[PDB]
């Protein structure tokens, strides 16, 4: 059946690595080295608070830092405390599980706590409620620290958010470690898949990651151990029918191993994300038969991105301090590579400007996809009417203060044809004050789309974009790209009865026993499709794709060539109207 | 009198196979095949959320899922935990209620736990209220799982929405199961109560079902065995009369055994649907006499609604897997079937425009009801405006994404000519964004009604649906299809006395004594009816159809024919003012 694990080595939330060594100067050097806070008489504290994605190393940096401690060095006690656990109407009852809790945390000497769900342990402390809300969040401050020398015991805090609380929680020079987690996306994303299937005595093919790494996007260790799980069974199933209706119990050999790809590519049409339960997010990489059509332009937007902003990312101080430089005494020096990379840059935005049904709102949720790490959100006025308790320009005012809170950022808007017809002024004014707000000198990216071309257009824009290379207009696609985009298809018309399905046999399978336990058209067809389609719009090509599939569905049994041109040339010839 | 059954064959809540084979999959093997957790070291969670409309296999899958597991295997345990029973003010008392009960699940091995009312259990988790809020939600998760490694016990839950709660109560990776219940429409519905009716020692006739079958629509297990008890004592009533007024108390016969389809008739003249408690839906079929009248186009409707979208729904895995297919490496050959029936298609929509009075808003549901199991739901402007808590259009981003959250689904608008008047540019525009916020490659109707003709229209429209065929126009029937309409009465006419019941006699039941226990002018007439209605509306014909049923109700009794012709005859002549 199940069980639990109580040893980790970081192989189901593994790749953080800068947080290890930031936790590890925390929680080793105050017992490693009992010298050197004397020679300096130093504090440091100790305390860290989770915040991002929950399972993403929620219970996973969990078990990871009760497991890396309990690796490190013996002996060490582990404390877990989940919310409120210990807790009553009373104020002095409550309480006193909780420093009953306190005491008996000091009595072993090597001890860390796990808190969790902070939210729930000491909310925000207000006087308009009954006041065990005051009185148990003024007891866990003095209980923690302020008159309480905690000595040699470790608090461990973790949330969804950063700040759902009051942040006299986090009084600084107590709690001074906050971690979040960033959802790793594509290679460490491939090394904890990597580092799942490795606990199989067939070893996983590696064509497949970071195949199916880059595929599973929004899960955490638990997930990723589900599709695990989901795949494997899937190969049970795939391996053995009779699993079904059993009184008389049965018994199996155990060379029952045998794992496919079919049964992974199953799995993602039979899974769910975790991010997308309830979110609605434009992670959608652009249509491979699609690349003909917008790869010509996709290069310039992923080439003039990487020019008008580079994406230069934080290399680690510990390989960075593992080179050395000779001369550290000088701040201009210092201020020399502070002016690196940080002062090359002006104001990040972008447009796009083309016409309707050309390869719109698809190539967003592309160039969305094809770099990541950076954090980003957009501008949904979805999103932004998704609340009325508060005014859309206090929650314009919000959410440009979290943007402000974070990493250099991305910032989209989608539909701005539509978009400055759905809001008033005063929202209007708001997001035109909320641009000048910040500097030049950070690195926030501004992507905008219309479905509308360009020269047309009101001039709100125009004076916020004056910038001959801040905007790309966008053209009809050659005819070589056209018939790139229609030659696989034509030659799915050659292909029809044994490469295709439309005349393959699909035969049964028997029941294991498992014993008892008690041509020359195709050319005028060829001036049909082309130049007599004078470069129309993708869309009506998605029509006439759509409309060819069905044909081909139909026509999906035949032999004898040239014999099915009459009905897609008639499906064309009713097209043109 | 009365009684409880323990035992269940799924025999009230049958038709859901694809989900007792995927709660076998996960309830059944873990003691089952209790090697291959090792030979895989496989986790795989247990944990069911139900949804969907409640009674309809809410309680009666609770007794399929004890009665399921009973019936499995011996012994085995089962537990019924029906929202707050166990709760108090205190937090420390209503939980020590909550885990004295998870040690004694935990203490008996073979044990399962039903779940219903969540929201009662456990609601959304907010400080703005008590903190028992956040407390017994923060130890429920505790104390089912993350610090819990439960072991062998299951936990099954139930609502009637999926989302009544935040997403913290489903932690991916423990409750990976959700069961929706689709209210099973013509053939499980047919086996749902052909499984009921075979409960009697008179089996009932099989031309009743599916006839009642699809009579009956939006129904649980529990009121269709109501509508066999109420067509059940319409029989003993009907019997006997003898069921009154007894102080000296009687004594039966026991060959009391008649059955009637005027009982079940009666039944449905006495009815009341459960779905049809509190909504309006139109599941209206189209009228049997206007068969004549509308059954022309309507196959030019269900069969272009069959081309412009198959209908087409996903097979049994069981009997999928059942066939076998040699090749199994080939993602390509999977991306081949995953691009068959899935790209053939581009937005589904489609218009009726024609004139007022001529077979209007009945044709809609009528092609509601000519094809189900679809999930639908319409954007009527009643059911927009039903609430003012919100916003209209955050009720429209809210059922946009829950049309969003579902299968391939259909949306339709009655009524566009008065609509587009309703609601101003704020709603309007914003549903024209949320047209294009979705892809074409999702399979998404758009049914569109209007009481105006054609070529004359706002072209609102017709940016929309530029498409030749997005739309049809109508037109007036034809005279043989109008002959074909007044045929019935134009031979009622000739059969009053005995055919109908006007000079039929209704004569008098005796007490039983249950002993005592201590012509030539209907062609003028025809000219009359024809030639001189120039092919009218179709709501005049019914104005004309009720006042000749007026006309034949007064004249209803009468022999030694061709006499009553003159007062239909000068009702037409009122009629043509």
Known sequence: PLGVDSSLSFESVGGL???????????????????????????????VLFHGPP?????????????????????????????????????????????????????????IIFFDEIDGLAPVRSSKQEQIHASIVSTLLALMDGMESRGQVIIIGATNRPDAVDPALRRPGRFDREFYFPLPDRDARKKIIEIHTRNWDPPVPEWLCSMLAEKSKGYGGA???????????????????????????????????????????????RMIPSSERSSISPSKPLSPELKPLLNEAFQDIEKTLQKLMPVASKLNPLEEVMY???????????????????????????????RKGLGQ??????????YEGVHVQSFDMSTLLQDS?????????????????????????????????????????????????????????????SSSPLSELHPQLREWFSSKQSV??????????????????????????????????????????????????????????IDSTTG??????????????????????????????????????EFMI
Not at 243 to 259: E, F, H, W
Not at 361 to 370: D, R
Request: one cysteine or more.
């Open 17 to 47: 690595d800068n947080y290890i060594n930031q936790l590890k100067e925390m929680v080793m050097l105050p017992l490693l080295y009992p010298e050197i806070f004397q020679r300096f008489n130093m504090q440091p504290p100790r305390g």
């Open 55 to 111: 399972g993403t190393g929620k219970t996973l940096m969990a078990r990871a830092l009760a497991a890396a401690c309990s690796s490190e060095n013996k002996k060490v006690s582990f404390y877990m405390r989940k919310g409120a656990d210990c807790l009553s109407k009373w104020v002095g009852e409550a309480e006193r599980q909780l420093r009953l809790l306190f005491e008996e945390a000091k009595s072993t000497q090597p001890s």
């Open 223 to 269: 997930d990723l151990r589900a599709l695990c799980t989901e795949a494997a069974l899937n190969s049970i199933k795939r391996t053995y029918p009779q699993l079904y209706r059993s009184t008389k119990r049965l018994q199996i050999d155990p060379k029952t191993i045998k794992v496919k790809v079919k049964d992974f590519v199953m799995s993602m049409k």
């Open 324 to 354: 050395d430089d000779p001369k550290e005494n000088d701040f201009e020096y210092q201020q020399r590579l502070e002016t690196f990379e940080t002062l090359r840059i002006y104001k990040p935005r972008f447009l796009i400007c083309g």
């Open 361 to 370: 709102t698809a190539l967003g949720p592309a160039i969305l996809q094809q």
């Open 389 to 449: 308790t508060q005014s859309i320009e206090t929650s314009i005012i919000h959410l440009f203060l979290e943007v402000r809170r974070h990493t250099p950022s991305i910032i989209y808007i989608p539909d701005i044809d539509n978009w400055l017809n759905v809001l008033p002024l005063t929202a209007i004014t708001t997001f035109s004050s909320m641009l000048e707000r910040l500097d030049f000198s950070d690195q926030i990216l501004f992507l905008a789309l």
């Open 472 to 529: 790309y207009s966008l053209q009809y696609p050659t005819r070589d790209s056209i018939i790139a985009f229609f030659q696989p298809i034509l030659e799915l018309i050659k292909a029809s009865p044994t490469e295709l399905p439309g005349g393959i046999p699909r035969k049964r399978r028997v029941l294991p026993e498992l014993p008892l336990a008690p041509e020359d058209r195709l050319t005028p067809l060829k001036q049909l499709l």
């Open 536 to 573: 129309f719009t993708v869309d009506q090509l998605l029509h006439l794709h759509s409309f060819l599939y069905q044909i081909i569905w139909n026509t999906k049994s035949e032999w004898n060539r040239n014999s099915v041109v009459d009905e897609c040339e008639r499906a064309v010839k």
